[PDB]
RNA sequence: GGGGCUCGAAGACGAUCAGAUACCGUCCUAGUCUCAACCAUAAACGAUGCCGACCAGGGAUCGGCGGAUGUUGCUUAGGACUCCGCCGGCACCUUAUGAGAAAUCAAAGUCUUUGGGUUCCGGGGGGAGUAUGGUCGCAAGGCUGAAACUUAAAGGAAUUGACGGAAGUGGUGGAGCGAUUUGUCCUUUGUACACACCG
């Protein structure tokens, strides 16, 4: 039984795709197959935000952010609940979270 | 089918689709039969009509509307309706 | 003016020619051109001729009770019930009961000789059921209306109060004129306003 | 590549007839396809057909009347004597009452009944019914 | 289909139905013929001669005007190439690739393309020997 | 009366030979 | 005794119909078995097989019984019914009603000279259900039914005297074997032959024929 | 559209222009020859619309057309008429 | 032969463990990099050979071309956007009028109404890609490739249930070839279990 039409990856009209290394376990996963998330967080937890914005010499100072594109293998993405097992009908939905 | 004696041997003579000429079978429940009434001058409906039957295949394809519209144009031309 | 001219006058008043940004491949035979922004303009002589053919079909049904008009839409109810009131057909409004045309043990069981619908894409369930009981269908089809199991698809704007009201009022007028109810030398006393949806 | 233009013609006609189309375009055109189409028209299985000259291999536009169940070629064009026509018709035809096998004979391209009437054998082009 | 690739392009020229010269063509037949003779005299091949007669002269197609093809006209006046033009160009490509490989040994892709080019050369040479447009013992090395 | 329509729809009306007593350009 | 719930049932009850081919002409769905009994009286009835089907449950297995029933008048009408029920007797009773409700016309022809009454299939015809494909070849008079036991019974009820058959696939699956044979018999009034080339006259449907009664 | 709504022998001429050159009833080229009129000098010098050669005015003047992927680009300040 | 950062078969050690020649941790040899010469094997997969014809709809996208556009930190064209087409390409969505054991597939369709051309290749499960012979290779191995004997199933798809050291009851009608299912909105999911994981 073939579970997915794309075989669990994104590879059409090409042969080899270079792999990445999983952020958690350092597993070798193809770049097109690995689960990829772009996390834009703040260097300061929502809580420390006020305390830090207070201890600032410069009154006008937007707190810098953190940008990171995180790579995950299937096992770690499922374990971390980044992706969850879905019903047969819902698997064909590729739309990002509504 | 006629016997060599000269008798009809078929239980019945099934209708054919007016668009695709296909035989309309007894269990073809998607098939229909449309009666288009005839109007004389002043728009009154005479009581006579022309009949078209469309197989379930042509209706399932979606070409039933266009097929019926073409058939009606032709007959209307011919009978002056 | 001619009767055709007057009817297309009312259609232009009611935006019955205003299509959608998308046009179905089996409805392209009625779309005349495409507006610059994307709207297809429906050829309204084709709409008038389809209405005339539908009326010819309806008046040939010598028992109007064998005709069902349905609108799952909210702007079609008034129009559908008034069309049934004037023509003499049956009007179901809102949800069709899956089984109405098939389940002979249902209380809502009916065997209509003709099924008139408002939008083939909002009314897909009764069309699917009519594909199981040899029921011919008349529908008011938009540019994007699927044409499966539709026998007389009138090309017209469905999404819209005025369009639905005008289309049903014209169809009822044509049916009654062919029946002789509206005498040819006289107009129809009912205005199109009573076919519109009330908020 | 195009190996048998007759096969493409007959298969396109068969697909169009199944689809309910009333016209089918044939490209390329050939004398064998026009001769097969004449047999088909003579037996009433097709209507008008039109050869379109394009100073190349031509085009044929055939009117379809819904009377076709199937038309196909036999490849290879097996040698068929007059005596083997019965076996071939049993193999390919729905009944001994209807259907035609088209043969290429030195007397011309013809249906199997006409081949029997002149006692001429040849090679099988195809069939239609 | 491309003989040596999966490409399925259909780009090509489409000759007009009218096989006679357009009324605006007024060049006399002998004029175009001697123009072709000069063109071949510097060394142009029939394809280039046709290109030049098309874009620099009022000659859309030589066959329509004269009634004959360029290679036939050149053969009539004894200026046709010894090696046919397509084979000449294929051999030129082959020797260019061979020179490149004599400089570049690691170019395995160019080696594969050279194999394809020489396969095309052998095909076309076999056809030309069968049609007697090449010496019966003509050999490519 | 005062049926404001655009160029494409007036084209259709013309193609249908429709004078449209109130047919007016929307500009 | 019988209260007809459909428009067709009302007309059949009153006697507006005499034969089942008037229903066949208009492809009307038959939803009351009393219609078939009224219009096709010479119907026999035979249970082809009883099959136990099991649905695995938490506590053991839930066994139901599937009954295959073939009806027919041996004169061009055949029907097949399949009903699954908790009791065998009700499974058979339900399948007989279903078999009557699926009574279809069967076209019969002549292998050669059209002498006497039709005795075989008019043409080669095939039916498929699951992996089972059933072919029927017209046979000369006196050939009999050259078929397996399952298709022979259906051909006997259809009224076919002579026929050659061939089958491929898992015909051991009797539901598919019997369904494929029934589909093959059904597709026999559907092959267009030059004798059906005459244009249809389009008689009135019984719905519009008796709108005064209905 | 639906081919049942058209005649394959008499196709609508509006939609034949947009078909590929080879996919028409009778294939014809969509190229043409033109009488290019330069700025001041007569030099009609017929040019192929899809010319692959840099056409130069007879009096060794500036270039008149530029080869491109498709139709040749006439140089700035030149008119033309189809032939 | 050179290079040898990192990582890292083997190895050593440290843990965990009932045991732990493993999983976890540390240091690491060959190797990982390169040159010359070999090797010719992968779930080398779309598990789908190639060429050709036909047969649904749709919107994206890439390359080229044509047409129409009205705005450009633009240098009239042209670029950049926008819209409409044509050809070609990687694909995607819907649908059955098709096919299929189904999963599913717009080809895996145009098949008992069976024939466009051509190559390779399978014939219950093991023994067995084993023995032997031959051939290639330095070797590792590659290619070709049995039999004796043994066995009543093995296997595929799908259904229900049970389990998971996974996540959070008829009737009639409708769907399915069907087991079944809908109705009934513990559920979803995986399963090689069905005596049902105490498997
Ligand atoms: K993924
Ligand atoms: K090219
Ligand atoms: K494209
Ligand atoms: K049920
Ligand atoms: Mg790979
Ligand atoms: Mg291998
Ligand atoms: Mg493989
Ligand atoms: Mg491969
Ligand atoms: Mg075969
Ligand atoms: Mg074996
Ligand atoms: Mg049920
Ligand atoms: Mg699995
Ligand atoms: Zn991981």
UniProtKB/TrEMBL annotation, chain B:
Per UniProt, the keywords (alphabetical) are:
Ribonucleoprotein, Ribosomal protein
Q: What biological-process terms (Gene Ontology) are attached?
A: translation
Q: Which domain of life is it from?
A: Eukaryota
Q: Name one GO molecular function term.
A: structural constituent of ribosome
Write out the GO cellular component annotations. Answer: cytosol; nucleus; ribonucleoprotein complex; ribosome
* Similarity comment text for this entry: Belongs to the eukaryotic ribosomal protein eS21 family.
Q: What is this protein called?
A: Small ribosomal subunit protein eS21
Naturally occurring in which organism (per UniProt)? Triticum aestivum
Covered part of the full sequence, start to end and full length, is: 19 to 99 of 99
From TrEMBL, chain C:
Q: Where in the cell is it found?
A: Cytoplasm
Show the coiled coil region(s).
none
A GO molecular function annotation here is: structural constituent of ribosome
What keywords appear on the UniProt entry? Cytoplasm, Ribonucleoprotein, Ribosomal protein
A Gene Ontology biological process noted in the UniProt record is: ribosomal small subunit assembly
What is its quaternary makeup? Component of the small ribosomal subunit. Mature ribosomes consist of a small (40S) and a large (60S) subunit. The 40S subunit contains about 33 different proteins and 1 molecule of RNA (18S). The 60S subunit contains about 49 different proteins and 3 molecules of RNA (25S, 5.8S and 5S). Interacts with ribosomal protein S21.
Record-given protein name: Small ribosomal subunit protein uS2
Q: Which family does it belong to?
A: Belongs to the universal ribosomal protein uS2 family.
The answer to whether the entry has keyword Ribosomal protein is yes
The protein's job, in short, is:
Required for the assembly and/or stability of the 40S ribosomal subunit. Required for the processing of the 20S rRNA-precursor to mature 18S rRNA in a late step of the maturation of 40S ribosomal subunits.
Whole-protein residues included = 12 to 210 of 308
- GO CC terms in record: cytosolic small ribosomal subunit
- Corresponding gene? LOC123093407
Q: Which domain of life is it from?
A: Eukaryota
Automatic annotation (TrEMBL), chain E:
Note the CDD domains from the entry: Ribosomal_S15p_S13e (cd00353)
Q: Name one GO cellular component term.
A: cytosolic small ribosomal subunit
**Gene3D superfamilies given in the database record:** 4.10.860.130, S15/NS1, RNA-binding (1.10.287.10)
Q: Which residues form the Small ribosomal subunit protein uS15 N-terminal domain?
A: 1-59
Q: Which Pfam families match?
A: Ribosomal_S13_N, Ribosomal_S15
- One Gene Ontology term of the molecular function aspect: small ribosomal subunit rRNA binding
BP GO annotations: translation
Q: Which UniProt keywords apply?
A: Ribonucleoprotein, Ribosomal protein
Q: Which residues cross the membrane?
A: none
**Alphabetical list of SMART domains matching this protein:** Ribosomal_S13_N, Ribosomal_S15
Classification via NCBIfam families: PRK08561.1 (NF006331)
The family assignment reads: Belongs to the universal ribosomal protein uS15 family.
Recorded hits in HAMAP family, A to Z, give: Ribosomal_uS15_A
Protein name (Swiss-Prot/TrEMBL)? Small ribosomal subunit protein uS15 N-terminal domain-containing protein
Q: Which organism is it from?
A: Triticum aestivum
The record's gene field reads LOC543174
UniProtKB/TrEMBL annotation, chain G:
S5 DRBM domain: residues covered: 43-106
Provide the Gene Ontology terms for cellular component: cytosolic small ribosomal subunit
Where, if anywhere, are coiled coils annotated? none
Q: Check the UniProt entry and state the signal peptide residues, or none.
A: none
Query: Which processes are annotated in GO (biological process)?
Result: translation
Mention one GO molecular function.
Answer: mRNA binding
Its keywords, alphabetically, are: Ribonucleoprotein, Ribosomal protein
Task: Spell out the family assignment given in the record's similarity comment.
Answer: Belongs to the universal ribosomal protein uS5 family.
Q: What's the protein called, per UniProt?
A: S5 DRBM domain-containing protein
The organism is Triticum aestivum
Q: Which gene encodes it?
A: LOC123105549
The shown chain, on whole-protein numbering, covers: 44 to 257 of 275
């Amino acid at each position: 039984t073939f579970k997915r039409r794309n075989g669990g990856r994104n590879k059409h009209g090409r042969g080899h795709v270079k792999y990445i290394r999983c952020s958690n376990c350092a597993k070798c996963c193809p770049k097109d197959k690995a689960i990829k998330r772009f996390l834009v967080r703040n260097i300061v937890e929502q809580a420390a935000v006020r305390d830090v914005q207070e201890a600032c010499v410069h009154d006008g100072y937007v707190l810098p952010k953190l940008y990171a594109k995180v790579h995950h293998c299937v096992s770690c993405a499922i374990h971390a609940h980044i992706v969850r097992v879905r019903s047969r009908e819902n698997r064909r939905n590729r739309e990002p979270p509504q | 089918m006629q016997n060599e004696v000269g008798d009809m041997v078929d239980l019945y003579v099934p209708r054919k689709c007016s668009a695709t000429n296909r035989i309309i079978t007894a269990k073809d429940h998607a098939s229909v039969q449309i009666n288009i009434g005839h109007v004389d001058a002043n728009g009154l409906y005479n009581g006579s009509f022309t009949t078209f039957a469309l197989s379930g295949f042509v209706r399932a394809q979606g070409d039933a509307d266009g097929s019926l519209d073409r058939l009606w144009q032709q007959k209307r031309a011919e009978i002056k309706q | 003016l001619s009767q055709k001219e007057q009817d297309i006058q009312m259609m232009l008043a009611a935006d019955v020619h205003l299509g959608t940004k998308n046009c179905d491949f089996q409805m392209e035979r009625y779309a005349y051109k495409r507006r610059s922004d994307g709207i297809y303009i429906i050829n309204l002589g084709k709409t008038w001729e389809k209405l005339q053919l539908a009326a010819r079909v309806i008046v040939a049904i010598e028992n109007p009770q064998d005709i069902i008009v349905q609108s799952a839409r909210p702007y079609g109810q008034r129009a559908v019930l008034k069309f049934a009131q004037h023509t003499g057909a049956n009007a179901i409004a809102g949800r069709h009961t899956p089984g109405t045309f098939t389940n002979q043990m249902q209380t809502s069981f009916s065997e209509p000789r003709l099924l008139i619908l408002t939008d083939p894409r909002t009314d897909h369930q009764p069309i699917k059921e009519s594909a199981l009981g040899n029921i011919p269908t008349i529908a008011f089809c938009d540019t994007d209306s699927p044409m499966r199991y539709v026998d007389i698809g009138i090309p017209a704007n469905n999404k819209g109060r005025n369009s639905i009201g005008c289309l049903y009022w014209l169809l009822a007028r044509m049916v009654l004129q062919m029946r002789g109810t509206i005498l040819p030398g006289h107009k129809w006393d009912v205005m199109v306003d009573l076919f519109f949806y009330r908020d | 590549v195009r190996v048998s233009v007759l096969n493409d013609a007959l298969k396109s006609m068969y697909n169009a007839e199944k689809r309910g189309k009333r016209q089918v375009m044939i490209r390329p055109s050939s004398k064998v396809i026009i001769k097969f189409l004449i047999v088909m028209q003579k037996h009433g299985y097709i209507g008008e057909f039109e050869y379109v000259d394009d100073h190349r291999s031509g085009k044929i536009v055939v009117e379809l009347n819904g009377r076709l169940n199937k038309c196909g070629v036999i490849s290879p064009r097996f040698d068929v004597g007059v005596k083997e026509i019965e076996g071939w018709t049993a193999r390919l035809l729905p009944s001994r009452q209807f259907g035609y096998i088209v043969l290429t004979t030195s007397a011309g391209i013809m249906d199997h009944e006409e081949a029997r009437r002149k006692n001429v054998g040849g090679k099988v082009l195809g069939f239609f019914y | 289909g491309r003989m040596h690739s999966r490409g399925k392009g259909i780009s090509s020229s489409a000759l007009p139905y009218k096989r006679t010269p357009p009324s605006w063509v007024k060049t006399a037949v002998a004029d175009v013929d001697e123009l072709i003779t000069k063109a071949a005299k510097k060394g142009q091949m029939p394809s280039q001669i046709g290109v030049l007669l098309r874009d620099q002269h009022g000659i859309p197609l030589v066959k329509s005007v004269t009634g004959s093809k360029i290679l036939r006209i050149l053969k009539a006046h004894g200026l046709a190439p010894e090696i046919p033009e397509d084979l000449y160009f294929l051999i030129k490509k082959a020797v260019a690739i061979r020179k490149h490989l004599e400089r570049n040994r690691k170019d395995k892709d160019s080696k594969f393309r050279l194999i394809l080019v020489e396969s095309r050369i052998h095909r076309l040479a076999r056809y030309y020997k069968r049609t007697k447009k090449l010496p019966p013992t003509w050999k490519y090395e | 009366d005062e049926i404001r329509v655009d160029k494409e729809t007036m084209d259709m009306l013309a193609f249908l030979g429709m004078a449209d007593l109130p047919g007016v350009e929307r500009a | 005794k019988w209260v007809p719930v459909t428009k067709l049932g009302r007309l059949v009850k009153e006697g507006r119909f005499t034969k089942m081919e008037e229903i066949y002409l208009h492809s009307l769905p038959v939803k009351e078995h009393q219609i078939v009994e009224t219009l096709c009286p010479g119907l026999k009835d035979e249970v082809m097989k009883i099959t136990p089907v099991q649905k695995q449950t938490r506590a053991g297995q839930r066994t139901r019984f599937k009954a295959f029933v073939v009806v027919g008048d041996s004169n061009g009408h055949v029907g097949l019914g399949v009903k699954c029920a908790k009791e065998v007797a009700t499974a058979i009773r339900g399948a007989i009603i279903l078999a009557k409700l699926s009574i279809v016309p069967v076209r019969r022809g002549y292998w050669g000279n059209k002498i006497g009454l039709p005795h075989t299939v008019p043409c080669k015809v095939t039916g498929k259900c699951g992996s089972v494909t059933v072919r029927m070849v017209p046979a000369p008079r006196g050939s009999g039914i050259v078929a397996a036991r399952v298709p022979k019974k259906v051909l006997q009820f259809a009224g076919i005297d002579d026929v050659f058959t061939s089958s491929r696939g898992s015909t051991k699956t009797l539901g598919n074997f019997v369904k494929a044979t029934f589909d093959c018999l059904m597709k026999t009034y559907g092959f267009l032959t030059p004798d059906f080339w005459r244009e249809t006259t389009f008689t009135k449907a019984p719905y519009q024929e008796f709108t005064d009664i209905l | 559209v639906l081919q049942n709504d058209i005649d394959l022998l008499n196709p609508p001429a509006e939609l034949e222009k947009l078909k590929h050159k080879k996919k028409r009833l009778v294939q014809s080229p969509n190229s043409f020859f033109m009488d290019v009129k330069c700025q001041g000098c007569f030099n009609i010098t017929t040019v192929f619309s899809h010319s692959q050669t840099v056409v130069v005015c007879p009096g060794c003047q500036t270039v008149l057309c530029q080869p491109t992927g498709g139709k040749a680009r006439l140089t700035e300040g030149c008119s033309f008429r189809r032939k």
